Design a binder for this molecule. Structure first.
Ligand SMILES: *[C@@H]1O[C@H](CO)[C@@H](O)[C@H](O)[C@H]1NC(C)=O
Ligand SMILES: *[C@@H]1O[C@H](CO)[C@@H](O)[C@H](O)[C@H]1NC(C)=O
Ligand SMILES: *[C@@H]1O[C@H](CO)[C@@H](O)[C@H](O)[C@H]1NC(C)=O
Ligand SMILES: OC[C@H]1O[C@@H](O)[C@H](O)[C@@H](O)[C@@H]1O
Ligand SMILES: OC[C@H]1O[C@@H](O)[C@H](O)[C@@H](O)[C@@H]1O
Length: 604
């Protein structure tokens, strides 16, 4: 008709649609695209009136506890309907931290955290996990995942070290395969730096956090990374170029500083390097109150935060609450000439480029036939395979002449499963699982270590559970062997920053009591290397299981010899925290276990 609007015509080239829509937009409509808000402050009027571009769920931001996939779809579609009702009918994009599966959602498959995936040295397995995670995120109506974290964690005292595949940038680079899993494979022609998402069964990805998040002093989270440019480029930057080659749609900026310059205010790196040198053409998003945190105290000159960030080259702001103040301030700056219209139009071009490329104008709403992808058994099988491949066997016998303890026999008259982490699903998942910080106990659907033991063993095997048994209990029990599981409690971000890296009690004391009475395999649950010589000295066998997720059977698959141990350390294991930082390749390199170490077993 001559009611035709070029931007709404799905047969037209993305760039022509972007230009067409951009040319029609008011300032308010443009700045609205640049604003991401929390679901917690969203309403239909707020979305319509402020022309909002994006919404997110932060860690723990859910419609309710226990919500079904359908509840999520209906929430997301309620917000979209309001956005589609604007004058221009620009669909919002909804983001979430789906960083080891669709991990805020009850019943979602929970994969091993990144450090364990690094142990697999299996980029294809990580691609398959991206694929499955895309399906589980679209199950809930969500179109955008804030992953992967491509930090290169150079000191395990950092609370986010588990979100890093490896201290070795080459392993992190290999694991950028998550990207084309989440988003689809890019076409043969593809230009490096262009955004890509295949369509409605994939999600937009986010390479985070740009750049040097893993390089901070003493592993202090969100702190300063002191390193010359050569080292920034040799260690922290290279996986970002792999991400551009694979069409990553967005990039999130780090809270951290580089030689004292806040990343959220770094024009040279965000615009000079990422955009102008790597030729990134997707959108750049802030972290959560990242612009606020440019100043100290945070939020003490929000006007400056806005100016600095948007001049630096950020495109979309994760406000996420004070939207009215953000929009008002940015509007003032453009009205005054402080921020030119060229900058606004660039940010909006990039946001719209991602939205059109990914099909969001053609499929703004959820597909209810996708809901049943959540927690699907084929995905649990994949997570079980990833958990097993992530395990690193550190010791299997106290002397070189002992019978190797693992693999254990499935038939025995009576066995003991013990420890604070043997029957606790939340501990085995760690942080970013249902809550931001994670949680304790049966927080979602899965199989604990105890549960997996009872599922694996011969029917005649009697399984006894005791969380913290004393030495007498064990010696009197008539046990053939024991499986004892201990380690770190869940943590995320600054909460996990830890200068001592010693596991909480009772952990060691239980291992001591158990191993002192019966031959024992110790399963260590952690986000990183921790002080381990005492646990080793007590144990016949010891496994570094990292944070393996919902599928505890991956642990028993290897314990009982269904598969051999194959994982290798993706990080150095230190002897003492006084050595840190200490990485493969330094001068004073004196590891307990070097990067790449891992004992093997043969199946059956
Ligand atoms: C690093 O942390 C120190 C110690 O708390 C703090 O005072 C300093 O401002 C931080 N620096 C950053 C975040 O750049
Ligand atoms: C070791 O660090 C953790 C968290 O930072 C703390 O819970 C534990 O009690 C610490 N002990 C110290 C700093 O002496
Ligand atoms: C596993 O197989 C390889 C040879 O195929 C051998 O080197 C290793 O020692 C074997 N261990 C056992 C228990 O068979
Ligand atoms: O209060 C918890 C919230 O605080 C923020 O700092 C976290 O990043 C969000 O992901 C989370 O929803
Ligand atoms: O949940 C939103 C954001 O919260 C921030 O605290 C984290 O640093 C990001 O990794 C995360 O995507």
């Amino acid at each position: 008709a001559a009611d035709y609007v070029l931007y709404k015509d799905a047969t037209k080239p993305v760039e022509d649609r972007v230009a067409d829509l951009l040319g029609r937009m008011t300032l308010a409509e443009k700045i609205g695209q640049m604003t991401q808000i929390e679901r917690l402050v969203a309403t239909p009027d707020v979305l319509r009136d402020n022309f909002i571009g994006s919404l997110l769920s932060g860690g723990g931001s859910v419609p309710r506890k226990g919500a079904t996939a359908k509840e999520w779809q209906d929430m997301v579609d309620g917000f979209q309907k309001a956005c589609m009702s604007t004058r221009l009918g620009i669909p919002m994009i909804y983001g979430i931290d789906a960083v080891h599966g669709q991990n805020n959602v009850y019943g979602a498959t929970i994969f091993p955290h990144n450090v364990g995936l690094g142990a697999t040295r299996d980029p294809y397995l990580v691609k398959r996990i991206g694929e499955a995670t895309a399906l589980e995120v679209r199950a809930t109506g969500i179109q955008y995942a804030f992953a992967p974290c491509i930090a290169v964690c150079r000191d395990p005292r950092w609370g986010r070290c588990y979100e890093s595949y490896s201290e070795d940038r080459r392993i992190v680079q290999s694991m950028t395969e998550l990207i084309p899993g989440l988003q689809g494979d890019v076409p043969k022609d593809f230009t490096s730096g262009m955004p890509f998402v295949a369509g409605k069964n994939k999600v937009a990805a986010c390479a985070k956090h740009f750049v040097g998040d893993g390089g901070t002093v003493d592993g202090i989270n969100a702190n300063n990374t002191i390193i010359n440019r050569e080292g920034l480029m040799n260690i922290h930057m290279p996986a970002y170029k792999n991400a551009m080659d694979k069409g990553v749609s967005t990039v999130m900026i780090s809270y951290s500083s580089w030689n004292g310059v806040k990343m959220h205010a770094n024009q040279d790196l965000v615009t000079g390097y990422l955009k102008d040198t790597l030729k990134f053409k997707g959108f750049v998003i802030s972290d959560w109150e990242g612009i606020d945190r440019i100043t100290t105290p945070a939020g003490s000159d929000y006007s400056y935060s806005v100016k600095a960030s948007i001049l630096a080259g950020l495109d979309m702001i994760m406000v996420p609450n004070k939207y009215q103040q953000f929009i008002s301030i940015l509007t003032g700056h453009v009205n005054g000439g402080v921020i030119p219209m060229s900058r606004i139009d660039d940010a909006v071009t990039r946001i719209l480029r991602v939205k059109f490329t990914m099909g969001l104008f053609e499929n703004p709403y959820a597909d209810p036939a996708m809901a049943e992808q959540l927690g699907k058994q084929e995905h649990r099988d994949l997570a079980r395979e990833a958990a097993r491949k992530s395990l690193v066997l550190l010791k299997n016998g106290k002397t070189s002449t002992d019978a190797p303890l693992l693999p254990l026999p499935k038939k025995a008259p009576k066995i003991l499963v013990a420890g604070s982490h043997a029957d606790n699903l939340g501990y085995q998942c760690g942080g970013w699982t249902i809550e931001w910080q994670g949680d304790t106990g049966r927080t979602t659907v899965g199989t604990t270590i105890l549960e997996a033991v009872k599922a694996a063993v011969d029917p005649s095997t009697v399984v006894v559970f005791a969380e913290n048994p004393d030495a007498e209990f064990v010696k009197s029990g008539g046990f053939s062997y024991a499986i004892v599981a201990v380690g770190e409690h869940p943590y995320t971000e600054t909460k996990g920053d830890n200068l001592n890296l010693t596991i909480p009690e009772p952990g060691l004391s239980t291992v001591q009591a158990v191993c002192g009475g019966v031959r024992c395999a110790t399963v260590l649950i952690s986000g990183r290397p921790v002080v381990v010589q005492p646990l080793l000295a007590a144990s016949d066998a010891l496994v570094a299981a990292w944070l393996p997720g919902s599928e505890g059977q991956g642990v028993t698959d290897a314990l009982f010899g269904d598969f051999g141990f194959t994982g290798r350390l993706p990080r150095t294991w230190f002897k003492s925290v006084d050595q840190l930082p200490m990485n493969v390749g330094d001068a004073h390199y004196d590891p307990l276990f070097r990067l790449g170490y891992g004992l093997t077993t043969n199946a059956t």
